[PDB]
Amino acid sequence: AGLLKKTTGLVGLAVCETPHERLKILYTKILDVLGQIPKNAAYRKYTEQITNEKLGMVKAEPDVKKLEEQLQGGQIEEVILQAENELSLARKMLRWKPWEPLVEEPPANQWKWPI
Amino acid sequence: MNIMLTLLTNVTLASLLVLIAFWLPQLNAYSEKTSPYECGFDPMGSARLPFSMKFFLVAITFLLFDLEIALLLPLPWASQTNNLKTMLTMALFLLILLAASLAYEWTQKGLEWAE
Amino acid sequence: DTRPTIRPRNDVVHKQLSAFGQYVAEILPKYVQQVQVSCFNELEIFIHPDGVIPVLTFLRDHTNAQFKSLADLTAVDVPTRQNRFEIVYNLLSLRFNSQIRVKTYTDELTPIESSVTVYKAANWYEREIWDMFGVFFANHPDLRRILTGYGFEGHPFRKDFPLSGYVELRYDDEVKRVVAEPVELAQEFRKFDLNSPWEAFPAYRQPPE
Amino acid sequence: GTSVKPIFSRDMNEAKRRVRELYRAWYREVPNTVHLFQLDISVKQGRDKVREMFMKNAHVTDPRVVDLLVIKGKMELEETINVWKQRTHIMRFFHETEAPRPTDFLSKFYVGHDP
Amino acid sequence: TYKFVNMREPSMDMKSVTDRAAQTLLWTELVRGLGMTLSYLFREPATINYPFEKGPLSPRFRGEHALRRYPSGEERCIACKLCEAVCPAQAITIEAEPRADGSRRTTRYDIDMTKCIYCGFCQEACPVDAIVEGPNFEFSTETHEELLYNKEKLLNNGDKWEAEIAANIQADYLYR
Amino acid sequence: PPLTLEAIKDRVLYVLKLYDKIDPEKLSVNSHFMKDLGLDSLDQVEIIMAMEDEFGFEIPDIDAEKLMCPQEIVDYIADKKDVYE
Amino acid sequence: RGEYVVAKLDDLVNWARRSSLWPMTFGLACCAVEMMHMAAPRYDMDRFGVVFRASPRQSDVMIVAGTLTNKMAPALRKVYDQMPEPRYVVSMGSCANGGGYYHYSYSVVRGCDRIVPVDIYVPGCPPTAEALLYGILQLQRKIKREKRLRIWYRR
Numbered sequence: 003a004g005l006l007k008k009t010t011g012l013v014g015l016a017v018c019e020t021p022h023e024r025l026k027i028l029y030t031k032i033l034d035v036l037g038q039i040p041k042n043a044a045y046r047k048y049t050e051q052i053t054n055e056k057l058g059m060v061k062a063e064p065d066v067k068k069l070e071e072q073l074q075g076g077q078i079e080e081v082i083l084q085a086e087n088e089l090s091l092a093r094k095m096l097r098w099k100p101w102e103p104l105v106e107e108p109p110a111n112q113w114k115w116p117i
Numbered sequence: 118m119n120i121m122l123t124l125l126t127n128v129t130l131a132s133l134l135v136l137i138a139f140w141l142p143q144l145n146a147y148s149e150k151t152s153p154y155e156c157g158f159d160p161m162g163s164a165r166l167p168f169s170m171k172f173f174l175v176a177i178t179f180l181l182f183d184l185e186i187a188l189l190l191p192l193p194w195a196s197q198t199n200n201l202k203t204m205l206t207m208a209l210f211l212l213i214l215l216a217a218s219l220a221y222e223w224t225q226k227g228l229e230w231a232e
Numbered sequence: 233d234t235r236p237t238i239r240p241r242n243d244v245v246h247k248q249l250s251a252f253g254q255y256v257a258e259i260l261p262k263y264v265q266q267v268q269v270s271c272f273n274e275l276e277i278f279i280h281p282d283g284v285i286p287v288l289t290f291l292r293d294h295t296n297a298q299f300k301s302l303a304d305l306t307a308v309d310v311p312t313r314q315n316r317f318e319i320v321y322n323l324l325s326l327r328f329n330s331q332i333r334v335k336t337y338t339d340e341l342t343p344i345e346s347s348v349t350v351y352k353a354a355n356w357y358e359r360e361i362w363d364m365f366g367v368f369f370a371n372h373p374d375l376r377r378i379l380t381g382y383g384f385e386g387h388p389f390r391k392d393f394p395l396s397g398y399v400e401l402r403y404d405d406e407v408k409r410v411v412a413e414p415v416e417l418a419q420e421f422r423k424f425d426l427n428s429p430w431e432a433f434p435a436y437r438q439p440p441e
Numbered sequence: 442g443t444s445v446k447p448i449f450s451r452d453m454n455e456a457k458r459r460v461r462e463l464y465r466a467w468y469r470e471v472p473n474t475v476h477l478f479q480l481d482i483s484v485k486q487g488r489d490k491v492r493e494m495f496m497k498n499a500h501v502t503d504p505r506v507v508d509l510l511v512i513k514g515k516m517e518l519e520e521t522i523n524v525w526k527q528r529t530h531i532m533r534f535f536h537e538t539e540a541p542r543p544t545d546f547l548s549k550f551y552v553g554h555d556p
Numbered sequence: 557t558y559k560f561v562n563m564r565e566p567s568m569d570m571k572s573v574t575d576r577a578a579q580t581l582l583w584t585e586l587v588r589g590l591g592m593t594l595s596y597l598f599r600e601p602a603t604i605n606y607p608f609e610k611g612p613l614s615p616r617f618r619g620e621h622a623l624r625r626y627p628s629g630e631e632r633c634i635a636c637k638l639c640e641a642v643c644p645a646q647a648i649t650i651e652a653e654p655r656a657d658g659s660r661r662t663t664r665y666d667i668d669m670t671k672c673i674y675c676g677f678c679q680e681a682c683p684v685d686a687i688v689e690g691p692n693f694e695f696s697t698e699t700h701e702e703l704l705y706n707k708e709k710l711l712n713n714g715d716k717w718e719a720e721i722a723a724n725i726q727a728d729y730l731y732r
Numbered sequence: 733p734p735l736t737l738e739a740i741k742d743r744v745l746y747v748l749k750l751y752d753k754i755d756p757e758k759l760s761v762n763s764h765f766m767k768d769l770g771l772d773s774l775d776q777v778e779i780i781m782a783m784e785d786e787f788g789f790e791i792p793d794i795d796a797e798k799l800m801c802p803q804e805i806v807d808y809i810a811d812k813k814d815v816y817e
Numbered sequence: 818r819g820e821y822v823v824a825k826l827d828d829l830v831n832w833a834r835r836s837s838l839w840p841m842t843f844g845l846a847c848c849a850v851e852m853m854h855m856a857a858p859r860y861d862m863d864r865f866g867v868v869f870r871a872s873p874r875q876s877d878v879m880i881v882a883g884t885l886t887n888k889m890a891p892a893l894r895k896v897y898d899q900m901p902e903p904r905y906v907v908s909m910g911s912c913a914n915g916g917g918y919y920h921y922s923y924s925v926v927r928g929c930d931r932i933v934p935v936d937i938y939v940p941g942c943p944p945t946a947e948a949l950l951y952g953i954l955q956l957q958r959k960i961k962r963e964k965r966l967r968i969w970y971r972r
């Protein structure tokens with residue numbers, strides 16, 4: 003499945019010796035939080051599409067290096083790092099919740115910048 | 118005689134150089150030329166409040182270690198004895214405790230400078 | 233080539249940017265008012281001021297955006313609008329090799345949620361915006377003047393603030409201290425009205441009112 | 442149109458409240474500020490200059506505006522407390538070097554075309 | 557294409573550790589630093605004996621300004637104010653008026669040499685090569701007012717550095 | 733020694749004496765600064781400061797708002813510093 | 818003669834002054850970079866006796882190199898007032914002379930003159946490191962023509 007890399011190169015990004023399960027558990031938590039999102043939101047369908055590809059993607063390939071190459075996300079440690087961000091984004095997305103229509107149409111000439 | 122004449126001449130020479138230092142160059146001074154220097158902008162008020170440094174522990178061990186060097190100073194005349202075995206054992210003994218004190222001082226934070 | 237002087241134009245980048253512009257527009261219809269891709273392949277997102285934090289957070293954290301570097305945060309002062317200030321965000325995505333522009337609007341008396349939470353780089357950029365223009369930002373940690381001198385009056389970059397300023401400086405010997413006086417220029421700044429009265433670009437001909 | 446979200450204060454009452462302790466925070470340290478910066482001026486003319494600056498900003502009748510001067514005065518207090526303004530910046534409030542501009546119409550007519 | 561600048565792991569064999577230990581105790585990299593300072597001591601200093609040996613310049617050098625005149629003698633400036641219009645720092649002030657003989661020149665052509673940025677934009681804008689930046693750069697003065705050149709001082713410069721400015725533009729006009 | 737309401741009375745009217753823009757004649761126990769002695773809100777802040785520094789302890793803003801007369805200062809200091817008599 | 822004795826003595830002091838100028842670097846803007854090139858071995862400011870020394874208590878001349886911003890203007894005066902005062906000020910570049918490029922700004926004083934008395938003015942933007950060497954050489958000439966003792970003898 004690939005030898006344990008001595009370092010990730012990036013400072014602070016510690017090497018994850020067990021990255022496969024970490025990706026699987028976080029991705030399941032992604033679809034978990036997306037459950038609290040009603041269907042109508044474009045955020046739900048898009049994020050589910052991204053994660054569902056990724057979830058069936060991490061489980062298929064057992065090797066780390068083929069996973070990193072095919073994921074197109076750099077080192078594996080970045081993938082858990084970004085998947086964590088997607089988790090926090092979806093959680094705080096639930097608060098603001100931008101499915102609602104535009105809060106206020108701007109003034110007539112706020113945009114349109116020839117002076 | 119000889120030693121005190123040399124001591125006298127040095128302090129008179131130094132004091133004369135001060136006297137010509139503060140009197141030969143005449144002064145055109147004011148209250149802004151006597152202001153304390155703080156790399157330009159106004160000082161916030163300091164230079165006499167408690168300025169606590171960190172090497173106090175090793176500063177005071179120097180005083181302890183300086184007493185060790187006082188104890189082992191008479192070694193040049195100690196070698197001119199008829200019982201060097203006892204002199205050698207005791208001379209190394211003081212060095213051992215001097216090394217031992219440093220080693221134990223080292224192990225328990227000691228030489229490390231407080232943050 | 234038939235255009236040795238005209239800068240070449242990329243359509244693939246235009247299509248990719250346009251597709252992403254629609255993507256962000258559908259994701260957060262609550263703040264995204266209008267989106268446009270300029271002729272030289274640059275994307276601008278026009279959000280409502282309340283969406284300053286949510287929109288930036290999405291661009292920073294979404295797996296398909298990953299815009300994780302605030303290049304700069306500036307505003308353009310346009311007095312002719314009701315909200316003269318126009319705060320502009322510039323973000324760069326290292327993973328996807330693209331840059332985005334997020335712009336809001338704000339009048340004189342309105343606080344904007346400081347983006348220090350999302351981008352810690354904004355912290356110092358926020359002080360410049362307040363100092364130069366006067367836009368106050370709520371929840372900012374240490375909002376204070378950054379560039380102008382201590383006890384400075386007004387906001388310089390505002391279009392209604394004169395270029396030479398209102399006050400000059402001088403060492404006054406009577407008080408033995410550098411003092412401030414009303415400005416008195418030895419030579420006034422000769423303003424040059426050099427705008428040709430003939431239309432330049434018919435493409436941007438604003439329709440008559 | 443007639444309604445816009447506020448800065449800190451919801452009406453004039455709490456806006457006036459935030460002015461009072463700002464004046465409180467400005468009253469107390471004036472003798473301390475005078476001591477800190479070696480002010481030539483005594484304490485007394487320091488206190489009313491704070492009073493006069495607070496007085497000239499009296500016609501304001503908008504909660505959002507009053508918040509802006511309140512926070513702006515807070516920075517001015519902050520700049521003065523942690524020796525960010527020097528003597529020259531403090532003396533800037535006392536317009537000393539400039540001659541008094543007369544207010545009668547006759548004097549203005551005598552000196553220039555100033556309306 | 558990237559390269560890892562600092563990813564060297566020292567060897568742990570008995571040879572390498574002793575060399576590092578020998579380097580530590582017997583200061584070697586410090587001696588190598590010392591040994592090379594000695595090398596520069598015996599080298600050739602690059603100092604030029606100012607002012608007997610002035611530095612090397614180029615014909616494009618921008619220094620003190622000057623108004624030149626035609627070989628006939630009449631000035632080149634016809635007061636088109638291009639130099640004043642393009643001056644980034646607005647250091648140029650020009651006032652023109654019909655001369656007695658007809659063809660009219662400036663009555664006031666002042667350059668503020670403490671406001672000038674020496675960008676050379678004036679000499680490019682000039683359609684008659686009237687205002688140029690001469691080769692001189694040693695016109696430092698004791699008083700601020702002496703810097704504020706007017707038409708007379710600039711015209712004097714044109715009649716002083718003409719033997720040099722003529723050659724410089726003679727060598728550089730083809731590039732422009 | 734203990735503290736009594738008279739003690740508050742004398743020191744309160746003491747500290748109002750030093751106030752420059754006060755009049756010792758019309759100054760009374762019932763004197764209303766807005767009404768009787770003609771001050772402003774910024775003025776009223778000064779006395780309640782002169783109150784707290786001379787009394788020592790700190791009096792917040794919430795009570796400095798509606799407290800207006802030397803009665804109110806003496807009554808309110810009494811409960812804060814436990815003067816029940 | 819008394820005048821002759823005061824004449825030689827003045828020359829000795831003036832020689833000791835002009836042969837040792839210790840600038841207190843006020844490196845502000847791009848004018849400072851060119852001044853360091855004067856310290857670079859190409860021109861070797863040190864060789865003229867003039868060597869860079871910090872701590873204005875131990876410096877003779879100020880070399881104002883760069884724009885003088887209104888915010889820092891008190892700092893310029895304070896570091897000027899703290900020099901043991903056989904003292905001179907050299908202004909480098911158009912900005913320090915009279916404002917230069919930023920003469921019309923809201924936060925740049927139109928010349929360092931308004932804060933401190935100014936000796937020889939060095940024009941340029943930036944003045945080349947050779948031009949500054951000429952400026953420092955001009956100050957040495959100015960120090961040479963100082964009649965401090967002669968004036969005292971004729972007071």
Ligand code: SF4
Nearest residue numbers: 643672673675676678
């Ligand atoms: S070189 Fe000087 S005078 Fe000529 S355009 Fe530039 S700033 Fe103006």
Ligand code: SF4
Nearest residue numbers: 633634636637639682
């Ligand atoms: S550009 Fe040349 S010709 Fe035109 S006004 Fe200037 S100096 Fe005269």
Ligand code: SF4
Nearest residue numbers: 883910911912942943
């Ligand atoms: S004069 Fe020119 S080089 Fe010198 S500080 Fe100003 S802009 Fe920079």
